[PDB]
RNA sequence: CUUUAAUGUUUGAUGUUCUAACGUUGACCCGUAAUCCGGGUUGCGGACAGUGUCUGGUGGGUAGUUUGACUGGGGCGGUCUCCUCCUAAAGAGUAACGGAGGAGCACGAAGGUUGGCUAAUCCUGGUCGGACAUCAGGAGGUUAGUGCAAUGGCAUAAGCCAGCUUGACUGCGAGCGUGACGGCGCGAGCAGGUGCGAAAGCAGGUCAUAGUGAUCCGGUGGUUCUGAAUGGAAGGGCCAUC
RNA sequence: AAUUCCUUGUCGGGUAAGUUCCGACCUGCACGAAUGGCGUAAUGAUGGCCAGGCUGUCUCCACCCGAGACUCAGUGAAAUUGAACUCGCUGUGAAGAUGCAGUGUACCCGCGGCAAGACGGAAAGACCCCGUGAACCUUUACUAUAGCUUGACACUGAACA
RNA sequence: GUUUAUUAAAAACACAGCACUGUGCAAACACGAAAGUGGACGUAUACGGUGUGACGCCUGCCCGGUGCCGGAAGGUUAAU
RNA sequence: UGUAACGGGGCUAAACCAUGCACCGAAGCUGCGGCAGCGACGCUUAUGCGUUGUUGGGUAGGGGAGCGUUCUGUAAGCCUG
RNA sequence: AGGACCGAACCGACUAAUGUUGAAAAAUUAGCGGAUGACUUGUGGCUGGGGGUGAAAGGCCAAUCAAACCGGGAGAUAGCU
RNA sequence: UUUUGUAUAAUGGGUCAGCGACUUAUAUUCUGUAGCAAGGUUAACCGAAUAGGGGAGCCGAAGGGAAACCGAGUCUUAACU
């Protein structure tokens, strides 16, 4: 309703993504996880971007 | 206000019975809560569908302190 | 394929796939084919001449399919493990 | 004169080895993020067409 | 060059005239004993008007159509997908315009893990303080709590806190449940890589069950696919997503 | 009230008695000024109401004259029709019976009459609903379009500021 | 006066009269892809369209809505 | 509309309750004769026959086996003033 | 003088009875309205089907007009009987 | 005939005789049957004309994958217990 998709992209050089949502009001920094980027194959930093 | 509405039903309940050999991983019973608790080679499922981890009979017991409903699975 | 109004089967599903347009000028070779061919050597030519493959075939692989009992010189043709190991056992030759 | 395919069935079913037709999931085309990642996993591979739709598919390719 | 004026030029902008395209449903001549037409003369206009192609607006004047179903007839009203309970006859399922309610979201913590903790309500005492705030004891024993309806669960808590965190992982999946189907669900275990814990272990989101939209067409990123003479490219496929 | 639901409003007049009529009141469900308001002599095969005359309209029907009906002779149709050896009652029953059950009644066949029944005849109900039927009509339903209108380019040129 | 020839003759249509409104004449308007024609061999005391309906006494208020008329500054806006 | 609320006559049981034995009563069951479907096995299978258990109501509908009509061949044959 | 008055012809068609397998697919009888007018009528002409014409009733356009008649698309389509 | 159900007072037929409704072409699949069989079969056309010629083609003996491609395997995935 007011819950927006956003996608994690992979710090690597890849451009493998995760798809999310985020509260935009009352969360408005970047969402930032450490997450699989299954490419190459190992846990790297991820970063809010938009959809 | 007005009424006239119902759900989908959604055929929980015992699918296999006392004395019933299973293939692991089978389906023992689904239920809301765990009206029946995971005893041993048994496991709960995240709707609370109780399953078999081995290969074997069905086994319902009455345990413990609170006479708690248990399925376990016997080697057969 | 009508189902009374319901979003039939061929639509409901989705479409998948390209076609290929150079499978169609690329054929198999069984090896039952290569003694079907006059003169012990096999190539698009060969084959095309003896009515195995279609004339407009530009690429053939001989598969393991059949026997073969006779030595064979294949060439210009690819040829799949199995199939070498049989043309060679019957005293055949391989060449690109 | 020769039967015509169903030419959009024709895009949607292959027909396997054992005379069976294989065909694509429904479901993976959008509506993603809200989708597990298990559950799309399982709708990538391909699937066989049902007993009760051999039928209407087979009607639909007669030349498959 | 600092700057300024004015004669010479391209394209416009605007205007004033001109005549020669074009208009004449003014007068006249001939074809011609003709209120048509054509040619010619003359007057009046004149690059306007008008027409062609394109284009915005208007357009029931004309045209082709649409304008749902359920329903104790139809219409009005209500309803249409999804979740919970009862009807439902102690396995599953089970109808009515039967009886009651709820959803079309929320959450980067309200997720994971380790470690810890334990409600409601009542009695007595206590500054301001009251029937009820916060404090102490006692009874009580989950009647509380669970982001939200209902039902089933929940103390080993699934309820409540804190530390560290990203398993709200990627590839798969023995075996099952539920479907006419499309589908939907549950799942130990396997490989890679990760968090928490001394360790056994736990984690593939949230106590569970609603919170949803097939296909087509199109967009964005990726790509050991394809690439209409050949090398590219466009377009297509595949994977991710809108 | 060609308009008033409540309504036969209420009051007055006419009648022995008047849901209509005329006159008045105003509480106008829901009059009103060229969608014209209110009047209006004359006109009217126009609507409502009253009276005189008149009468078979009626109380209540009688008699009579003629054309049919009836009989004889000649000609000679029709609609309809599964088959009929084609009664009443009460009950039963696709729920309103000549045909079923029980029972009553009835010797066989015409002719003149009557219309209670044969859910009598005639027309594949016009009401009502249904069909993803048809048509015509309306509009600020949708999509188009003639027409009307805008501007660009073409037919379309010159001189001068 | 007219009308549903064949179930309605009427209170319906028409009507003289009134008003609004278009129309400068190659008129507006109408039939016509056009040519041609009606309007009209007429010319605003004329011609068309709309409403009202002899006559008498008269015809009040409302321009927010919808329709129409007028406007050029600003915004938006087509082909090109 | 007419007895019309035992079907009627009529019944004091020819009603009701209890016990008992008899009998009537169907296209059910038995008996005699017969046809066929499916099995099975026989005296003995070139495939029907012979024994033998059993089955044989049927709409929509599926399956199986046939009759007859017209025309072509068989047929310049065969029947027919 | 007059879309003046009464009233035949002529034009119409207000009421009733009859007729309704009729004498007649709209009439007959008794009555009725207009009758110098926006009257009536003969002959010939013109207007044509989304078209005409209409003192306007969706009236009329060759005995059924909210789209004539004939031929064609044509075996339109008919989830109905 | 239609129906849950028709003696039905539901439909249809006055009667008789003649006619009157699941066809035909081409595709496709299955069954039965016949031929040949890892092969089977030709089409137009030629023709010596129901022969013979014609094997252009088509189906089948190979699949998997979207495809490149690999191939009794293949795809899936970095790789599969
Ligand atoms: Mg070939
Ligand atoms: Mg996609
Ligand atoms: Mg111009
Ligand atoms: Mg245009
Ligand atoms: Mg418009
Ligand atoms: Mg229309
Ligand atoms: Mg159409
Ligand atoms: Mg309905
Ligand atoms: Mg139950
Ligand atoms: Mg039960
Ligand atoms: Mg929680
Ligand atoms: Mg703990
Ligand atoms: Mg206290
Ligand atoms: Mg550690
Ligand atoms: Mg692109
Ligand atoms: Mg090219
Ligand atoms: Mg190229
Ligand atoms: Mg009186
Ligand atoms: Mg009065
Ligand atoms: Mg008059
Ligand atoms: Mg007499
Ligand atoms: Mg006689
Ligand atoms: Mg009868
Ligand atoms: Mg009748
Ligand atoms: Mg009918
Ligand atoms: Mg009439
Ligand atoms: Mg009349
Ligand atoms: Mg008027
Ligand atoms: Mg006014
Ligand atoms: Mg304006
Ligand atoms: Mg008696
Ligand atoms: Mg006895
Ligand atoms: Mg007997
Ligand atoms: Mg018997
Ligand atoms: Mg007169
Ligand atoms: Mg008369
Ligand atoms: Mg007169
Ligand atoms: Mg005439
Ligand atoms: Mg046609
Ligand atoms: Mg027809
Ligand atoms: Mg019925
Ligand atoms: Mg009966
Ligand atoms: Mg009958
Ligand atoms: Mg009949
Ligand atoms: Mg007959």
């Given amino acids: 309703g007011i819950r927006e998709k956003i996608k994690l992209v992979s710090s690597a050089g890849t451009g493998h993504f995760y798809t999310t949502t985020k509260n935009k009001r009352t969360k408005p920094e970047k ?16 970063k809010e971007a938009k959809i | 206000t007005r009424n006239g509405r119902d759900s989908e039903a ?18 023992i019973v689904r239920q809301r809560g765990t009206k029946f608790h995971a005893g041993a080679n048994v496991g709960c ?14 086994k319902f017991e009455v345990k413990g302190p609170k006479n708690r409903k248990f399925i376990s699975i016997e080697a057969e | 394929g009508f189902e009374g109004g319901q979003m039939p089967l061929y639509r409901r599903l989705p479409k998948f796939g390209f076609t290929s347009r150079k499978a169609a000028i690329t054929a198999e070779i069984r090896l039952s084919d290569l003694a079907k061919v006059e003169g012990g050597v096999v190539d698009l030519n060969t084959l095309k001449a003896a009515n195995i493959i279609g004339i407009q075939i530009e690429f053939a692989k001989v598969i393991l399919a059949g026997e073969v009992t006779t030595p064979v010189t294949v060439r210009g043709l690819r040829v799949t493990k199995g199939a070498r190991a049989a043309i060679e056992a019957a005293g055949g030759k391989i060449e690109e | 004169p020769k039967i015509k395919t169903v030419r959009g069935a024709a895009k949607r079913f292959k027909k396997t080895g054992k005379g069976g037709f294989k065909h694509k999931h429904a479901n993976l085309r959008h509506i993603l993020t809200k989708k597990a990642t298990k559950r799309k996993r399982h709708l990538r591979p391909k699937a066989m ?4 739709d051999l039928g209407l598919v087979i009607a639909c390719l007669p030349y498959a």
């Fill in chain 4, 49 to 52: 067409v049902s007993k009760g």
């Fill in chain 2, 45 to 58: 499922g995240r709707d609370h569908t109780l399953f078999a981890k081995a290969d074997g009979k069905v």
């Fill in chain 1, 31 to 46: 969402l930032e996880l450490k997450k699989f980027d299954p490419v190459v194959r190992q846990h790297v930093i991820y």
């Fill in chain 2, 10 to 27: 959604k055929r929980l309940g015992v699918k296999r019975f006392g004395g019933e050999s299973v293939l692991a991983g089978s389906i």
